[PDB]
Amino acid sequence: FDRTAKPVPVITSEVTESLEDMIRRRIQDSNFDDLQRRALSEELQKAHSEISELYANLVYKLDVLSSVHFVPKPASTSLEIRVETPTISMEDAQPLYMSNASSLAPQEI
Amino acid sequence: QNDLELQQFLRESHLLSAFNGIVYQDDQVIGKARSRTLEMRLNRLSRVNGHQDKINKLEKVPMHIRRGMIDKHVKRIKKYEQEAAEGGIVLSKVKKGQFRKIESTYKKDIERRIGGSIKARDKE
Amino acid sequence: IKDMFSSAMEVARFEGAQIKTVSGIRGEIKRALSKPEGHYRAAFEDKILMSDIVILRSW
Amino acid sequence: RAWDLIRYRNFRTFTGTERIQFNCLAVDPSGEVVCAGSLDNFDIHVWSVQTGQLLDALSGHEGPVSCLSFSQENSVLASASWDKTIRIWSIFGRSQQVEPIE
Amino acid sequence: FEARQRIEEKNKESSDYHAKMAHIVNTINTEEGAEKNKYERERKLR
Amino acid sequence: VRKLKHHEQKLLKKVDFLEWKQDQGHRDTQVMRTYHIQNREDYHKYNRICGDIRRLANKLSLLPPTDPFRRKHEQLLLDKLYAMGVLTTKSKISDLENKVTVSAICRRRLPVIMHRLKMAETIQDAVKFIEQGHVRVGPNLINDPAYLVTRNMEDYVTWVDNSKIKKTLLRYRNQIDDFDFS
Amino acid sequence: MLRRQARERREYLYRKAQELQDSQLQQKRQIIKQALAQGKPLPKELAEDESLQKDFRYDQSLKQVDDEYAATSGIMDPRIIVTTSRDPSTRLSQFAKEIKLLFPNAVRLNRGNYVMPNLVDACKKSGTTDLVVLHEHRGVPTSLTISHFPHGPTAQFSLHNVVMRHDIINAGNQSEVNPHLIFDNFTTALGKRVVCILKHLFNAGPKKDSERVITFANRGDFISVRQHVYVRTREGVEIAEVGPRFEMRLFELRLGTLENKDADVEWQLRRFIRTANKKDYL
């Protein structure tokens, strides 16, 4: 008679041996299927600058139109230079002050 | 003859000089040169298998201003070639009913509005 | 399924075989039931009826 | 982001991983941890202040976290959100305990 | 055991038969339709 | 205006007192009739922003096809407009010329969102309801029709509590609990 | 977040339907891309449509993990609940203990009086990612269902040759370090789908000297799962066997969570078709 599906395989010593030396080949070649943890030109530069200022103005009015529920800009690890100066001088124009330190730490000097 | 970059540079030498060392290779070609260069390449590729009544559609221009466009362009062409017709230089050779392609042809984008030749006279 | 076998040994001999009803509903015999002897449990393509006959084509 | 009011410098900036906009915050009394909640994310973002990393994302509200506050004495976090629920998080010391008050 | 053996031998037999029939079909196609088209080509000259 | 005879219609063909060429086929009127726009200048206030998007999209497609500035800003603008809801798919960049459209910005308005959420039977009913002050997004009551509802901000479009409309839908299914006022 | 998750799944399957609908433009844009690349003439259908080329000016700047797992693949570690069927036997509770020790970032939940709708709702608003529901037959565990929770897929498997670490001997304690993975001949697209499902419930990026490994080796639609520790000798690499071994067979894979069974089936085992036992990953 004909039969519908193949039966479940019996796990014997030969199939465990074949499977183990498969694992040994992979594990000595480090064949592991793991998950892996996640200037130019003058004309090109000024084309970039024009579409940059267009992009800036358009994003501003899209945010204001959207009633500022938006989704933020992705990420930017930028680079900031700060000179040393008194934090008196880093303040607003008024008669008083709030702190007379220097903007750089001792371990930054 | 089967160099592709060389022959593309050869037949797009005119509008690169109209809308510019110089750049010619794609990944360096800024705006209007890029749009017309890509459009010229797509026209030249599609003119083989596409139908001749469907590949080169003219922009719809009214009669009394398209005819004036053609008359002023032919006046420019006659003035240019008539200017140096007597000269011994290698003026390039055109066919019989076509318009001579000049610097105002490449800059004014005139062939989208007037075609390369009056196809009613070409048909007759 | 009631009577094509006389014993659970016979059904054990024939496990996994493909059967079908006369309606062409394909099926497979799965396991012999314990207390009624030649009775077994089969699984079909969908719900068969009480007016059907299953068939094990052998040679 | 964090601001030293001596040297007038933004010395720390904390972002998430999901690009959301933050609407309320709450700091530790013993200011190791800052905490912030959004109106489009349903999570609470828990950052260390000493290092800059994202220490945790507390989850369990089913509505936008409208308000956050740390208790000033026993340092338990209270968040409350538009799913009609105030929720009390014991963050510190092996608990990870959540008590929701409807 | 007889289940696994009978299933895999039937699969082998079917996969052999399909290869054999497809082989004889397209050998009759290729090396006789070339002659059909050759006769049509040398009949079009008349 | 009087159905000119044959010699008159032949003699003055370009005469038209209603449809002009500067009208652009009355499409401000057409889409403000479709989406029930109150004031006359909302079409053109949206048309300026569609022209901004398409001007930047032209000037950005005129960059070379492989540089990361063009690819980053095209993808970034595409993501922003999909998240806002004007664009319906962030896949292809020809949406930044073809599918960006005053009707798309108008479909994102509050009564149209309402009517698609089945919260009102027509856009004019939705206009009447949010003028009468039944609709809040989030906690705060929204009072004007022109309010643009982004994709994440349409999850919070509900009725105000103590609404008569909320009361009659709850009492239609007689799930009205008078403890919480509705 | 009920309405947000419903409309987010709605927008995702709208975008997926729009992709398969307008995926012809992707490949004919590819045709005119390579026609620009090597200067060969363009077909009549791609030659007479003027709108596609003036969209191609815009579209010339266009260009593994799949749509449910792609957003947070290596960014965020998983969070797995392991629960039994209902009123489980003690050997199923031992097996659920062993599966929660198999997967790191997995906890175990007592099952009794938990309806599957509000269980799924409690998980997918408490922030868990995967649910593993284990079914038994008089001790012997017979099925496991994996449901990925932000409206992801459920893969339902049967388990066949189950030998348990509680059943063998006091061989010691487990390791619980982030393991290495081995997937042997998952060759079809269903094979890659099942690989992505089975491996986005392990932590991303183990150590390079992480001394435990777990293998999913396909042998004719019977994924043998073993787990091994190793220590590399001077001549080979010595494998010791630790933790449970079984064979799982996928019989269903559908595209919603566990609660509905109104989700669209991506694949399910056609058992009674005429050519059933003739192909693998059928």
In sign, the C-alpha dihedral spanning G198, G201, G205, G207 is negative
Question: What does DSSP say about strands D44-48 and D33-38: parallel, antiparallel, or unpaired?
Answer: antiparallel
Is residue B23 within 8 A of residue B29, CB to CB? The reply is yes
Cα F109 from Cα G214, distance rounded (Å): 54
Distance (Å) from the alpha carbon of F176 to chain A's nearest alpha carbon: 33
Do F96 and F75 meet the contact criterion of CB atoms below 8 Å apart?
no
DSSP F27: H
Quick one: which of F175, A100, G203 has its CA closest to D8?
A100
Listed in sequence order, the DSSP H helices in G127-206 are 165-168, 189-199
Q: Which residue of G has its CA nearest to C19?
A: G272
Q: Name chain G contacts of D43, Cβ cutoff 8 Å.
A: 127
Residue with tokens 């200048």: F41
Beta pairing class for G265-268 and C18-21: unpaired
Residues in G touching F152 (Cβ below 8 Å): 4
Residue of B11, B42, B43, B47 best to disrupt the G interface, most CBs of G under 10 A: B42
CB contact under 8 A, D7 and A70: no
Chain F residues with CB-CB distance to A70 below 8 A: 80, 83-84, 150
What is the C-alpha end-to-end distance of chain E, expressed in Å? Answer: 68
Maximum alpha-carbon separation in chain F: 78
Cα gap D60→D102, rounded to integer Å:
13
Chains that touch B (3 or more CB pairs under 8 A): A, F, G
Using alpha carbons, select from F52, B111, B56, F96 the residue that is nearest to residue G55: F96
Contact C47, C14 (CB under 8 A): no
The CA distance from G280 to G251, in Å, is: 12
With CA atoms as reference, report the closest residue to F110 among F143, F83, F152: F143
Of G256, G268, G52, residue with least CA distance to G149: G256
Query: What is the residue-wise DSSP string for G220-238?
Result: SS-EEEEEEEEE--SSS-E
Strand G80-84 versus strand G130-137 pairing type: parallel
Integer distance in angstroms from the first to the last C-alpha of chain C?
21
Q: Which helix (H) or strand (E) segment is G55 a member of?
A: helix G50-59
Q: In the structure, do chain A and chain E come into contact, i.e. share 3 or more CB pairs under 8 Å?
A: yes
Q: Enter the tokens of residue B16.
A: 């690169």
Own/partner pairs for G6-12, CB < 8 Å, 24+ apart? G7/F154, G7/F155, G8/G151, G9/G151, G11/F151, G12/G67, G12/G151
Distance CA G264, CA G28 (A): 29
- Across the beta sheet with D33-38, what order do the strands follow? D22-27, D33-38, D44-48, D54-58
Cβ F88 vs Cβ A97: under 8 Å:
no
Nearest-CA neighbor of D56 among D82, D101, D4, D95? D95
Each residue of B81-110: b (16+ CB within 10 Å) or e?
eeeeeeeeeeeeeeeeeebbebeebbebeb
| HSE toward the beta carbon, residue F111, CA cutoff 13 A | 24
Q: Which residues contact A99 (CB under 8 A, 6 or more apart)?
A: A87, A88, D5, D6, D7, D8
Way it was determined: cryo-EM
Rounded to 5 degrees, φ, ψ at B115 are 80, 180
The residues facing D25 across adjacent strands are D36
Pick from G259, G255, G150, G130: nearest CA to G193: G255
Task: Please choose, from the candidates C23, C28, C33, C25, the residue with its C-alpha nearest in 3D space to the C-alpha of residue C2.
Answer: C33
User: Is G61 within 8 Å of F93 when comparing Cβ atoms?
Assistant: yes
In angstroms, the CA B71 to CA A24 distance is: 84
How big, in percent rounded to 5, are the helix, strand and coil portions of chain E? 95, 0, 5
**Chain F contact set for G55 (CB, 8 A):** 92, 94, 97-98
Is there a contact between D82 and F152 if contact means CB atoms under 8 Å apart? no
Question: Cβ–Cβ contacts within 10 Å for residue A60, how many?
Answer: 10
Q: Could you tell me whether strands G212-218 and G180-184 are parallel, antiparallel, or unpaired per DSSP bridges? A: parallel
- 8 A C-beta contact, residue F159 and residue F182: no
F68: nearest CA in chain B? B27
Give the nearest chain E residue to A6 (CA atoms): E4
Cα B18 to Cα B105: distance, rounded to the nearest angstrom: 10
Distance CA G53, CA G138 (A): 66
What stretches of chain G adopt beta strand conformation (E)? 80-84, 106-108, 130-137, 140-148, 154-159, 180-184, 212-218, 223-231, 238-241, 246-254, 265-268
Instruction: State how far the Cα of G282 lies from the Cα of G270, in Å rounded to an integer.
Output: 8
User: CA of G124 to nearest chain D CA: how many angstroms apart?
Assistant: 9
Rounded CA gap, G70 and G86, in Å? 33
User: In chain G, which residues touch F (CB < 8 A)?
Assistant: 3-4, 7, 11, 15, 18-19, 22, 25, 55, 57-62
User: What is the C-alpha to C-alpha distance for residues A15 and A23, in angstroms, rounded to an integer?
Assistant: 12
Minimal CA separation from F61 to chain B, in Å: 8
Name residues whose C-beta falls within 8 Å of residue D58's C-beta, 6 or more positions apart in sequence.
D43, D44, D46, D77, D79, D89, D91
Question: Which of D9, D10, D23, D39 has the most A C-beta neighbours within 10 Å, making it the best mutation to test the interface with A?
Answer: D9
Secondary structure, 3-state, chain B: CCCHHHHHHHHCHHHHHHCCCCCCCCCCCCHHHHHHHHHHHHHHHHCCCCCHHHHCCCCCCCHHHHHHHHHHHHHHHHHHHHHHHCCCCCCCCCCCCECCCCHHHHHHCCHHHHCCECHHHHHC
Task: Note whether F60 and F70 are within 8 A (CB).
Answer: yes
Provide the pairing of β-strand G140-148 with G154-159. antiparallel
Could you tell me which residues come within 8 angstroms of residue G131 by beta carbon, excluding any fewer than 6 positions away? Answer: G80, G81, G83, G119, G120, G123, G145, G146, G147, G149, G258
Q: Kindly report the backbone phi and psi dihedral angles of residue D23, in degrees, each rounded to the nearest multiple of 5, phi listed first.
A: -115, -15
Q: Which residues of E touch G277 (CB under 8 A)?
A: 7, 11
Are β-strands G130-137 and F157-159 bridged in parallel, bridged antiparallel, or unpaired?
unpaired
- Whole-angstrom Cα distance, residue F30 to residue G152? 43
Going by their DSSP bridges, the two strands G140-148 and G238-241 should be labelled as unpaired
Q: What does the alpha-carbon distance between residue G122 and residue G81 come to, in Å, rounded to a whole number?
A: 11
What's the Rg (C-alpha) of chain E?
20
**Chains D and A touching, counted as 3 or more CB pairs less than 8 Å apart:** yes
State the pairing for strand pair G80-84/F157-159: unpaired
Question: Which CA distances in Å does F167 have to F162, F180, G32, G147, G196?
Answer: 7, 11, 60, 39, 48
Backbone breaks in chain F (C–N > 2.5 Å) follow which residues?
Answer: none
Q: Do A5 and G271 touch (CB under 8 A)?
A: yes
Q: Which residue has the tokens 């496990």?
A: C15
Phi then psi for residue G131, to 5 deg, are -125, 130
Which residues 6+ apart lie within 8 Å of D55 measured at CB?
A: D33, D46, D47, D48
User: How would you classify residue F26: left for phi > 0, otherwise alpha for psi between -120 and 50, otherwise beta?
Assistant: left
F157 neighbors F109 (Cβ within 8 angstroms): no
CB of G282 within 8 Å of a chain A CB? The answer is no
In angstroms, what CA-CA distances link D100 with B2, D60, D88, D90? Answer: 75, 9, 6, 11
Distance CA F67, CA F134 (A): 50
Strand segments (E) across chain D: 2-3, 10-12, 22-27, 33-38, 44-48, 54-58, 65-70, 77-81, 85-90, 97-101
**Cα separation, B3 vs G165, whole angstroms:** 69
State residue G186 phi and psi, 5-degree precision. -100, 95
Taking CB atoms within 8 Å and a gap of at least 24, the contacts of E26-32 are none
Closest of F54, F63, F60 to residue F81, by C-alpha: F54
Closest of F95, F101, F96, F109 to residue F28, by C-alpha:
F101
Q: Does G35 touch chain B (CB under 8 A)?
A: yes
DSSP string, A12-78: -HHHHHHHHHHHHHHHHTT-----------HHHHHHHHHHHHHHHHHHHHHHHHTTT----------
Cβ-defined contacts of G274-278 (< 8 Å, 24+): G274/C26, G276/A4, G276/A5, G277/A3, G277/A4, G277/A5, G277/A6, G277/E7, G277/E11, G278/E11, G278/E14
Residues of A in contact with B28 (CB under 8 A): 41, 44
Whether the Cβ atoms of residue G99 and residue G134 lie closer than 8 Å to each other = yes
- End-to-end, the C-alpha distance of chain B in Å comes to 35
Q: Kindly state whether D39 is in contact with chain F, defined as any CB-CB distance less than 8 angstroms.
A: yes
The angstrom resolution of this structure is 3.7
- Indicate contact of C with F: 3+ CB pairs under 8 A: no
Amino acid identity, position G148: H
Q: What is the DSSP letter of F160?
A: P
Decide: residue F106, CB within 10 A, 0-12 exposed, 13-18 middle, 19+ buried. Answer: buried
CA-to-CA distance for G261 and G120, rounded, in angstroms?
13
CB within 8 A of F155, min separation 6: which ones?
G3, G4, G7
Instruction: Give residues preceding each break in chain A, C–N over 2.5 A.
Output: 38
Between the alpha carbon of residue G57 and those of residues B31, B39, G35, the distances in Å are 11, 8, 14
